[PDB]
Amino acid sequence: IVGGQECKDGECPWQALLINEENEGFCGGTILSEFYILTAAHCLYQAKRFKVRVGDRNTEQEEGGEAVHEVEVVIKHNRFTKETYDFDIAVLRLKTPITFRMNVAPACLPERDWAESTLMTQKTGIVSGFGRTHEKGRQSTRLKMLEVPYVDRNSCKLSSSFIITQNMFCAGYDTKQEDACQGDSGGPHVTRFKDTYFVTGIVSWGEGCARKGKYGIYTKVTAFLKWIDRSMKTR
Amino acid sequence: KLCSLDNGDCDQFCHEEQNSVVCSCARGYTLADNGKACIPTGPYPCGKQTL
Ligand SMILES: O=S(=O)(/C=C/c1ccc(Cl)cc1)N1CCN(CC2CCN(c3ccncc3)CC2)CC1
Numbered sequence: 001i002v003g004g005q006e007c008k009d010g011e012c013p014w015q016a017l018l019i020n021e022e023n024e025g026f027c028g029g030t031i032l033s034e035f036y037i038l039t040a041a042h043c044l045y046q047a048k049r050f051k052v053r054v055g056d057r058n059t060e061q062e063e064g065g066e067a068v069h070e071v072e073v074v075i076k077h078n079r080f081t082k083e084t085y086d087f088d089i090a091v092l093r094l095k096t097p098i099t100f101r102m103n104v105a106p107a108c109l110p111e112r113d114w115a116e117s118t119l120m121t122q123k124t125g126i127v128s129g130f131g132r133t134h135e136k137g138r139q140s141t142r143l144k145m146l147e148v149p150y151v152d153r154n155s156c157k158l159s160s161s162f163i164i165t166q167n168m169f170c171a172g173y174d175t176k177q178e179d180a181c182q183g184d185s186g187g188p189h190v191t192r193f194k195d196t197y198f199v200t201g202i203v204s205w206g207e208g209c210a211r212k213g214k215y216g217i218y219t220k221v222t223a224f225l226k227w228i229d230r231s232m233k234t235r
Numbered sequence: 236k237l238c239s240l241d242n243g244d245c246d247q248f249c250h251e252e253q254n255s256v257v258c259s260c261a262r263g264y265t266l267a268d269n270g271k272a273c274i275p276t277g278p279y280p281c282g283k284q285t286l
């Protein structure tokens with residue numbers, strides 16, 4: 001997360017972290033409910049075996065609100081492929097349930113129609129993660145959050161060097177030095193409506209971080225709703 | 236009517252079924268008596284910051 005603020009107490013409770021053997025965060029996720037985590041399919045490749053961590057805001061000083069959960073089964077979308085990064089989405093079924101407490105709570109899944117017309121037509125959305133605070137620096141120790149304006153679907157395609165599929169959308173800034181970065185992928189893209197937040201996207205990819213002229217590419221959640229429900233019933 | 240006005244005065248989901256407005260809520264919430272407001276049925280309802 002280049003630029004942006006720090007997630008203060010309880011501000012980003014639906015945030016999740018995928019940790020590897022080394023116990024280091026390599027990707028993000030979004031807590032959907034006590035048993036399921038939302039993430040990007042391409043993150044399932046960046047690690048041998050992994051577990052997820054909730055209620056963690058500082059990777060250094062142990063916070064009693066933390067918990068580690070093992071994965072029971074990963075539902076990765078078949079249509080996904082690294083060449084196009086299309087269908088960059090996946091749902092995780094946890095072995096033990098998540099104890100919702102402060103800094104640990106689920107994000108609401110919206111209705112498809114309502115979201116596309118009310119949620120994604122809002123000016124901004126919020127993205128967060130423990131990823132790099134710079135294109136070359138190292139993984140962040142603190143959980144950050146960034147207000148990212150929605151990007152006109154057209155500008156998105158023009159600025160982009162790759163095929164922006166209908167399963168993706170742009171968010172970020174053209175010049176301002178703010179956008180997600182490595183390690184942030186898989187994280188939550190949420191939109192705010194009357195103090196209640198809704199999952200809207202999955203930190204997917206970009207051509208670098210906060211590059212002038214480029215934007216952050218996010219998996220369009222509203223385009224996989226029915227798929228997510230199916231997954232929460234496992235399939 | 237007109238979920239476009241101001242979301243039809245709903246708290247969350249807004250549907251225009253028939254001629255009128257029709258509000259609803261995310262899982263974990265129950266529609267209020269006024270059929271507009273959404274009410275949490277648990278200590279940690281989705282989309283709410285634990286402040
Ligand atoms: O700097 S990064 O670490 C990313 C940080 C970041 C920033 C914003 C967001 Cl919302 C998410 C992630 N780096 C850049 C290059 N790509 C690798 C690229 C390989 C080619 N590519 C596509 C996309 C669509 N069709 C065909 C090819 C995109 C990805 C790997 C990773």
Ligand SMILES: [Ca+2]
Nearest residue numbers: 058061062063
């Ligand atoms: Ca900690």
